[PDB]
Structures are given as structure tokens and as C-alpha cells.
Design a protein around this ligand. Structure first.
Ligand code: MTA
Ligand code: MTA
Ligand code: GXQ
Ligand code: GXQ
Lengths: 281, 281
């Protein structure tokens, strides 16, 4: 049996590896190299440009925290945009909210959607929901053109090397600000606090040029580098995203495996050295 | 340049790797294989039987949370025992408390102490403190023979394969209970919640046969498998270890890099699936 190894200039000097049970699919899409394989202990794995995007064993941690942190703070969210997120995990969590009326998703690479529909059926099931509308487009351009404003925007991007290079700059967060309702919220995948704090500092600085409240949360997930990933949290209100406004008690949420009301707030309690680094931003 | 890779039957199918700048020391001690190397991005690394014990870049997360969770809950701790912990990291954090009168450490492998004194001088500096007393002994036997009782016992063991095989059973926690003051606390390194929950369940069951309050906390640390490690927390009082009783404000603690008053409690806010698993223990 061979091993898959995640090497990157984005985290030099370290690598995480998963034993391969079977390779399922590979292709070079218009935008990126796509790899799908069944691992021996983490289930099926999606890889883009050599970087693990998700595994069946732990993806719920990332998709639940990214979705339910902002969706329990927004009081009656009606229109939600997912940027990236071609696998559908965020959509799956969003569909649980009966009050949502529309879910737009802007994914640049249609191959990712199609592969997830074929090989990750318990992750992409939300595409069957009639409220979901798919746009195959660079979100940098979608956000410049969209006429609607959203209650919540969830930025579920790949990393800054590749097509997502357009999603990590000041102009991008200005487009996000303008596409939000006056009381709207944005969360975005953000650098692991064990790697490039300098990047976290850059993103926070960008968001603070526009948003009244900018908070950073941490998620434990073993198959992202250093075992965790941040949530950049942007609010137009000064109350922010640290405290939920509802409990997830209906039957649609009985299956949750990571998120709960107490974890929501706990995710924002950061290690001392990081607090120190972002203090004067 | 070569790479060091951490493979183990204890976490089958996954591995974490660090690029090697230089190998510094290797030996087969009486108990275990010892490896010290300078990594390219995590500083110096200590490896026992192929398993990473610490790196200079992130060890503060584990040593601060293991020490200051129980040391801020105990009100006037006077006598503290470290089990294992030959590298000295726990001792380093304990020495910051001026009120401590005595620190015993029971480490089975004197080679680990000597190697840490030679190659990890900013981790083993606490051995110079006159309150520290070293016992080179199996802690299973030390705990059977010790006449003193302790305010806090910190179990900083290696994994269950090897000399630490005697530290993960019911009889061990009975010895711990008896070596504690009536209001004493024990914390122990415990399995990562992303791997063998069954083991966490076993340890909790053991501790609950004796301790009134048994809690589990999580630490983010990238160079342990799955990026995190648990703290098994055992109290004879029903108030437990989740809430500190003091703030660490004196100058000895100005250098802290992970622990703070809010993180202490946040570490005990666990993912939903784990809460569900331990519910009926
Ligand atoms: C797998 S979830 C991350 C998704 O983000 C998508 N993505 C990357 N860059 C962009 C971009 N500019 N616009 C929209 N989606 C993107 C990637 O194609 C990937 O499927
Ligand atoms: C490096 S910190 C972990 C330490 O736990 C030590 N250790 C392992 N088993 C025991 C044991 N039974 N008694 C005392 N120390 C132990 C190991 O030698 C290691 O140095
Ligand atoms: N919907 C699946 C998630 C896609 N986002 C992932 C977030 C983490 C990233 N690794 C890099 C971590 C350091 N920024 C891969 C894509
Ligand atoms: N004082 C340095 C710490 C020694 N304890 C480590 C704790 C984690 C362990 N990996 C296994 C993690 C799964 N139980 C290595 C030893």
C-alpha cells in the first residue's frame, strides 16, 4: 500500500501523510489538480493541488463550525452565499435551517462539484435542495456583479496558491462588505495559528478597514496542517459572532457531531501568544 | 536533507513528518530508543521509541496547560509530584510558583533527564532549582512506597507502548488517589479525542472508581498525532478543575505563551461526539 503526503511551501518542513487504500479519481481541471482516494482510516479524501480539502472522518468539524457559528448569531437569515465550497459540506449544514429561503454558491471549478456528487454523496446531498442555486464563476467577479445582498456569507476557499489567490486581499473584503445586508455577517477560512500568524494579521487588518467587529476562532481538525484552522469573523454590528442567539434544538440538528452552544464561544478563546500578536492591528 | 516520520500502531494509517536539519544524539537506553535532532522549522525535537515527545516550537502549549490548569485551582499547593516528565518542562512551569516548597519528579529513564540537560537547556532549567528532588524509578513502584502525600500530581507520561505501560490502569489510579492530600488534584496526559475514544473512556472509568469529579480537557499542539492531546482531570472535591481560583499576574508568568484565565475553562468545552461517548461512564 502507498501513502499520500501533503507537502507545501505554505508549511515548509512538515508534512502529514495518509495511507492509501485505493485511488478513485484523478484529473487536471481547468483550474487545479484533483485527486480522490479512499484512505485506510480516514475514509475518502479530496485533494486539490496536493492539499487535503476534506476527509470523511473529520469534515463535520470544519463544516459545522463554519456554518453554525454565523447561522446561530444571525437572527432570521434568509439569503446565504457560500464562496468556494464545491464539495457541498457548508450547503449540507445550511439546509438544516428551515427559515433559509435561498442559498447561492459560487464555485470556480465545476469539476469539484461533479466529483463530490459522484464520490462524496453524504457531503454533497444538499445540492438536491430546491433552495440551492449554483454559479460556476470566480467569486471575485461574482461579488462584483451580484445585485442581491446576503444575511451571511461563508468563504470556504482553498488556499492562497491557486484559484483562491483572488480571495485574500483588501479589495475582496470590500466586495464582501458591500454584498452584505446592513446587519450581515461573513466568516472565512483563515490561516492556522501555528503557522503564519503574519497572514492572520494581514487578513484581520483587511477586515477591520471595513467591519466594526473582527474576531478569530479556532477549529480542531486533524487533517488540516498543524491540526487546526482559523475562522475569520466579520460583523457590521459591534456585538460580533462570539455568542449564539439560538440553540439548535429541532430534529434537523440531532445529528451534529462537533458544534454545540458552549463550543461556539469556546472557539474564540485563543492562546496567549496569538492575542499578543494581533493586539495593535 | 532527510525527514523524520512518526509511524505507530497507536495511530494506524496516518503519519506526521518533520524535515531534519541535523541529527544530534541517538542511543538505546535501558528502557527505550532515544533520538534528538534539530528540525528545520520546529527547532530541536526529542523522540522516544519513534514517538515525538516535544519540540522547541510548541512544547509550551502542553507544559503550560498541564501545569497551570491544576496549579491555579489548588489554592496553596506546597508539595507537587511529576510522574515521567524527564525533559523538565513541567518542572519549569512549576518553579514559577513561589509558594511551592517541594517538587518531586519520578522519571524511570535517567538518560532522558541527562539528554534534556545537554540538548534542551531552556526546557530543563528547572532542575537547578533547590526545591526539585529527582527519583529515578518506575512511578508504579514509587507511588506504592512514597510516605508523603501531594497537593498536585501531574502525570506527564510517554505512551502506553513502552515503560509507561504501567501507568494506564485501575491499580495506578488507586495509587494516585492514595498519594494525594484529601483536597488534592491529579492531571494526566490522555488519548487524543480524534483517535481512540475507547481509551479515553477506559481512563475516565478508572478515575471515576475513586475520584468524585473526573473531567477531560483538550490542548492544541501540532506535533502530537491529530494535533491535540487530552488532559484527564481528577478531583476529590466536587468543584473539579474547570475554573481557576487565581490569576497568574506576578512577573514569573509574564512569559506565558498559551495559558490564560479564559483558555483554562475553554479547554473543557469538548466536541459534541465526545460528550456523547463518555455520557454513561
Ligand atoms: C473544496 S472547497 C474549496 C473550493 O474553493 C474553490 N475556489 C478556489 N478559488 C475560488 C474562487 N476564486 N472563486 C470561487 N471558488 C474558488 C475551489 O475550487 C474549491 O473547490
Ligand atoms: C519525555 S516526558 C515522558 C517521560 O515519561 C517517562 N516514563 C515512561 N514510563 C515511566 C514510568 N513507569 N515511570 C516513570 N517515568 C516513566 C519516560 O521515560 C519519558 O521520559
Ligand atoms: N469544504 C472543504 C474545505 C476546503 N477548505 C480547506 C481549508 C484548509 C486548507 N489547508 C490549508 C490550511 C492553512 N491555511 C485546505 C482547504
Ligand atoms: N514532557 C513532554 C511530553 C511527553 N508526553 C507526550 C504526550 C503525547 C504522546 N504522543 C501520543 C498521543 C496519543 N496518546 C507522546 C508523549
Amino acid at each position: 500500500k502507498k501513502w499520500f503526503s501533503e507537502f507545501s511551501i505554505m508549511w515548509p518542513g512538515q508534512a502529514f501523510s495518509l495511507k492509501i487504500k485505493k485511488i478513485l479519481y484523478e484529473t487536471k481541471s481547468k483550474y487545479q489538480n484533483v485527486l480522490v482516494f479512499e484512505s485506510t482510516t480516514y475514509g475518502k479524501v479530496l485533494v486539490l493541488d496536493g492539499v487535503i480539502q476534506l476527509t470523511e472522518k473529520d469534515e463535520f468539524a470544519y463544516h459545522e463550525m463554519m456554518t453554525h457559528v454565523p447561522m446561530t448569531v444571525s437572527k432570521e437569515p434568509k439569503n446565504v452565499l457560500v464562496v468556494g465550497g464545491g464539495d457541498g459540506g457548508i450547503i449540507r449544514e445550511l439546509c438544516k435551517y428551515k427559515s433559509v429561503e435561498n442559498i447561492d454558491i459560487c464555485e470556480i471549478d465545476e469539476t469539484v462539484i461533479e466529483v463530490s456528487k459522484i464520490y462524496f454523496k453524504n457531503i454533497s446531498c444538499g445540492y438536491e435542495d430546491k433552495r440551492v442555486n449554483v454559479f460556476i464563476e470566480d467569486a471575485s467577479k461574482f461579488l462584483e456583479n451580484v445585485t442581491n445582498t446576503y444575511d451571511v456569507i461563508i468563504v470556504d476557499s482553498s488556499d492562497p496558491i491557486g484559484p483562491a489567490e483572488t480571495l485574500f486581499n483588501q479589495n475582496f473584503y470590500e466586495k464582501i462588505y458591500n454584498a452584505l445586508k446592513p446587519n450581515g455577517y461573513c466568516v472565512a477560512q483563515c490561516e492556522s495559528l501555528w503557522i503564519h500568524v503574519g497572514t492572520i494579521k494581514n487578513m484581520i487588518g483587511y477586515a477591520k478597514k471595513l467591519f466594526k467587529k473582527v474576531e478569530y476562532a479556532n477549529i480542531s481538525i486533524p487533517t488540516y496542517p498543524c491540526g487546526c484552522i482559523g475562522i475569520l469573523c466579520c460583523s457590521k454590528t459591534d456585538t460580533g459572532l462570539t455568542k449564539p442567539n439560538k440553540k439548535l434544538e429541532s430534529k434537523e440538528f440531532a445529528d451534529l457531531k462537533y458544534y454545540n452552544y458552549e463550543n461556539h464561544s469556546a472557539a474564540f478563546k485563543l492562546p496567549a501568544f496569538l492575542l499578543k500578536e494581533i493586539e495593535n492591528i
